[PDB]
Amino acid sequence: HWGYGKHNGPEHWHKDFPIAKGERQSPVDIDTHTAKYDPSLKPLSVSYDQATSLRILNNGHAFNVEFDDSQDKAVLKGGPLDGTYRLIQFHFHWGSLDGQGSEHTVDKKKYAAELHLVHWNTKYGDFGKAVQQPDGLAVLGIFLKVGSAKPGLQKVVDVLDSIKTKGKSADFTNFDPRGLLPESLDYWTYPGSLTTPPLLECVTWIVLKEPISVSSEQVLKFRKLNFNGEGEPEELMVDNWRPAQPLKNRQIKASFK
């Protein structure tokens, strides 16, 4: 199946998932000079105080931190969004080297990694029905650069050696995703897609301008995970990013002047 290698990576995905060449694929390059301030944007509200994390899973692509989304607990609203979107999971994309790893780029600059906090529109009842809708999902995208450590990341880093291989999971209760947010909520937004198969075109992307800093030691631990399952040859989990796709008939809006 699909992955990030030479023979199954992003340039092959279109064969099984033809929407890979669709009209609102993600990620994209964010040209900061072309992005326009949008005064119709409402203030963004990231309300994560009652978040209930449950588990961390290596899915042979990245690792997912999953949340209990059975009640309105951790939600994203305002900004470009109509209504209330509930956090269901987060994960990252990263590189083999600090010069690459993010999926969005900013004036062609690649960051060392990118965090995606995935939410679904509660008007659609569950995540499965939300991914059949053009406004089913909202993904909050946050860049990571290598510099000072991010303390609120360390609980994630320290659990990784327990989910080294594909199919492994661990308890991951009481993790507070507020510790992953930068100071500013300035952001860019545009309509796009999931960035792994099945590449569904359901996402309002909200990409924060301010990166968070993580330490070289934190990101090195990401790079010690494995794409392979236990008892199989080691293939390090690195470079699990999709590159920027054509912007097509879209405009990137900025929340800031």
Ligand X SMILES: O=C(O)c1ccccc1S
Which secondary-structure segment (H or E) carries 207? strand 203-208
Which residue lies nearer to Zn ion by CB, 116 or 253? 116
CA dist list (Å): 241 to 26, 28, 62, 73, 141: 11, 12, 10, 29, 13
According to the annotation, is 196 in a ligand binding site? yes
Please give the span between the terminal C-alpha atoms of the chain, in angstroms, as a whole number.
44
Residue 194 binding target from Zn ion, ligand X, none, CB below 5 to 8 Å by type:
ligand X
- Judge whether 166 and 157 are in contact, CB under 8 Å: no
Residues contacting ligand X: total by CB under 6 A: 5
Cβ neighbours for 166, distance < 8 A, ≥ 6 positions apart:
58, 59, 60, 226, 227, 228, 229, 230
If one asks whether residue 238 binds ligand X (CB under 6 A), the answer comes out as no
Which residue lies nearer to Zn ion by CB, 44 or 199? 199
Give the SS3 label for residue 253: strand
According to the annotation, is 116 in a ligand binding site? yes
- Nearest approach, Cβ of residue 151 and ligand X (Å): 25
Based on its alpha-carbon atoms, the radius of gyration of the chain, rounded to whole angstroms, reads 17
If one asks whether residue 116 binds Zn ion (CB under 5 A), the answer comes out as yes
Could you tell me which stretch among 108-116, 128-136, 152-160, 168-176 binds Zn ion (CB under 5 A)?
108-116
Tokens standing for 166?
């594909």
The position carrying tokens 């000079």 is 33
Which residue lies nearer to ligand X by CB, 25 or 226? 25
List the x/- string, 106-145, binding to ligand X by CB under 6 A.
----------x-x---------------------------
- Judge whether 196 and 16 are in contact, CB under 8 Å: no
According to the annotation, is 105 in a ligand binding site? no
User: Binders of ligand X among 166-205, rule CB under 6 A?
Assistant: 194-196
Sequence ranges of the binding site: 91, 93, 116, 195-196
Interacting residues toward Zn ion by CB under 5 A: 116
Interacting residues toward ligand X by CB under 6 A: 116, 118, 194-196
